[PDB]
Design a protein around this ligand. Sequence first.
Ligand code: SF4
Ligand code: SF4
Ligand code: SF4
Ligand code: SF4
Ligand code: SF4
Lengths: 84, 296, 79, 76
Amino acid sequence: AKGIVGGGCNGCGDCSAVCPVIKPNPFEMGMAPRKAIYIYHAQVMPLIYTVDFDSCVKCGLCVEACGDKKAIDLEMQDEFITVK
Amino acid sequence: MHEYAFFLGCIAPNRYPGCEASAIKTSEKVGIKLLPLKGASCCPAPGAFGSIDLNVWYAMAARNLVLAEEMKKDIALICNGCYKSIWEVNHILKHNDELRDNVNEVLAEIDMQFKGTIDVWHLAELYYDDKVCGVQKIKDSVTTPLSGAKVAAHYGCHLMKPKKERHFGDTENPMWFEELIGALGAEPIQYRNKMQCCGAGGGVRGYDIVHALDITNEKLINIQEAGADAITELCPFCQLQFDRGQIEIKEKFGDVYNIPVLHYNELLGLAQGMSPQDLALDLHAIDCTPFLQKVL
Amino acid sequence: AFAVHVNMERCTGCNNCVVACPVNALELNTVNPSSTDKIYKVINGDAVILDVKHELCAGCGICVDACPYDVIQLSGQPP
Amino acid sequence: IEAKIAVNKDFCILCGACVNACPGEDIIYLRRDSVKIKGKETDLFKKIKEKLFTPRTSKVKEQPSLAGSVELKAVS
Ligand code: SF4
Ligand code: SF4
Ligand code: SF4
Ligand code: SF4
Ligand code: SF4
């Protein structure tokens, strides 16, 4: 929709392979590390790799790892929708 | 200089007078003024007298409270059992109307009424509060470091428990009394089951001395294993148990510890420079001389 | 914006914590004085810190280094 | 008569400890213009350049809500 033909997120994992931030995983009740860009577990239904903006340092390594897929938009903001 | 009526129950004046002497001196050195209570008696000791008759327990504790009420002052205490009696009867009779009535018509035979106008404080509680002398003020007043001494704290039971009836917070692992010992410069150590009863409460000290001494010996074993060089305490009951009971343990059992037992006021006096003779450390069953060699 | 605590019990009124503070020395000893507020003033023989809300100190340690019988503790951690 | 303080610009490395330590009002004026790096760049590094390159000076009577730390003056 935004115009990137090559696609969005396919869940490859390169972004979290290169992210340098490491934070606790709330799915694992904090026992396990997860990067700033992450999925809870490998069986999440939308396999889309959220970015944790409270902990991201905007280093930009994730976008270079994502490459032509261009799925990462580090400047995204809270959008509001009204549904009847 | 805050002023408090000094209740001074039975054991501190009549067995360990250095405790009360150091109480007055150290409290005056920090900003506290301890005034004698005029004709106070035994706070009806909560175990040995509450076990017999709760109504006379109420009446005697209320008489002790109305002495300081006429003095128009706040009670200050140095005993956990006296705290139980005085503070808890004050709290109960500030809220229970039929008990107020009963105690008042008992006290009317001696021209004396309870109205519930004052508050009861433990001296260590005052030393810990920030409005009154705080931990920093205690550190300021300390003039002899007392460094290089391992000191084990015994909280007792009647000061902090039950926590649904007091306001000192956690009873499972409090650290406030450990901060007062750390202010003096002595390092407080932690031992197994540090919140265990000493065994002297409830009249067990008198009824079954062997049972009480076994409860005490469990503590003494844990404290020696930790490696303490003295046991600080905030109760003359607990001090009497830990002091006499070491001798009775040495005779009834075959266990030797020789661990000095000192009230926190006695340690505060030692920190502030009072002499061992002026503290009457010769009146304890267990010699304090090794601890004095270490901290002096 | 730190917090200084003066042990009133051993303060002698020497006034070498008032004279040596470089924020006190701003009023009379600066060209075109910027701020004329003072951390300490010795009232009744002991040093009183007027800087109640911890806005003017700069953790210099000139006052801790000045008191002859150490009595000023400087706190470098948020109050 | 004499000066009370001065600096040697040959040896100053534009660190900022002097500004962070001075209890005065605006004795010191610090402004860095260019950091010298190896490695290419990043949007994060441009943000960090913008943060490091704002001029600063001492301040007396900073806000109490942040007591326990330092706050400098933003120079226009
Ligand atoms: S955001 Fe990009 S790099 Fe990360 S999993 Fe999705 S497609 Fe792969
Ligand atoms: S921009 Fe954020 S998510 Fe991407 S690599 Fe840097 S810290 Fe990780
Ligand atoms: S640390 Fe420096 S600025 Fe703060 S009160 Fe002491 S002398 Fe004054
Ligand atoms: S320099 Fe020390 S002793 Fe003198 S007034 Fe200040 S705090 Fe008190
Ligand atoms: S403190 Fe830093 S900025 Fe100031 S003169 Fe020294 S090196 Fe230069």
